[PDB]
Chain A
Amino acid sequence: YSLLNEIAAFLKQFRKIAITVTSYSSKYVSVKRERALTLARSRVVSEYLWSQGVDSRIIFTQGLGSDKPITSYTLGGDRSPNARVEITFRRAV
């Protein structure tokens, strides 16, 4: 939560309209289990960010499972570099 507080203190420096939070994971059991896992992870993280005072108008959350890997080395578990959460936005004016 100290890291999430640090990220919220970063996000308060800008002015913005929408934020997107998307979560991706690695392949464990089926497609459904990690789709549910990534959706739950993104829901919790965006809630704590909304609880802190980021002055956005919309926050979108989605979880894509293990569909879009950024690396062909898939030997770790959760230690793998392609299990991640990404927060993207556009600075407005």
Chain B
Amino acid sequence: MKFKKPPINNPSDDATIKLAEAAVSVSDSMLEMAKVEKVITPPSKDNTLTIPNAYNLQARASVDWSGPIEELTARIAKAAHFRFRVLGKSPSVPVLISISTKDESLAEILRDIDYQAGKKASIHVYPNSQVVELRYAKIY
């Protein structure tokens, strides 16, 4: 009758212990402040209006990217068989994105890119003309 308790994993490093302890505190600070911002200014509009879906926007992708926005958007448009268009001047300080997902549709990839672009750039999709259009902000 040997006694045992169920989770028996691989051994752990105390560096990873300390890193995990810092990360948990960062995480609930982020959660509390996000709750406050949602309460203070409730959003009203959604980018499904600017990026609707279509047929052959339902091919799927998994992505690991850590660079500027324009080349990645060009790769997605080329995989979706759409034309690619740029409006405005690119800024001198580049617009950097970071996406790490698994198995989602190309429309949601563009919507996540659109959310991370923020105040610097925007994504529009015209399905009747089959055009993906990225436009830069009139800042600087």
Task: Consider the complex of A and B and state whether they touch directly, i.e. have CB atoms less than 8 Å apart.
Answer: yes
**A residues near B, CB below 8 A?**
18, 20, 39, 42-43, 46-47, 50, 56-62
User: Are A60 and B61 interface neighbours, CB within 8 A?
Assistant: yes
Docked complex: B37-82 residues within 8 A CB-CB of A: 59-65, 75, 79
Count contacts on B: residues with CB < 8 A to the other chain: 11
**B residues near A, CB below 8 A?**
59-65, 75, 79, 102-103
Selected contact of A43 from candidates B64, B79, B103, CB within 8 Å: B103
Cα A42 to Cα B58 with chains together (Å): 13
Residues of A contacting B102 in the complex (Cβ-Cβ under 8 angstroms)? 47, 50
User: Are B60 and A60 interface neighbours, CB within 8 A?
Assistant: yes
3 shortest A-B CB distances, which residue pairs? A62-B59, A61-B60, A59-B62
Cα A50 to Cα B65 with chains together (Å): 15
Shortest beta-carbon distance from A33 to chain B in Å: 16
User: Are B65 and A61 interface neighbours, CB within 8 A?
Assistant: no
Task: Please name the residue on chain A nearest to B64 by beta carbon.
Answer: A57
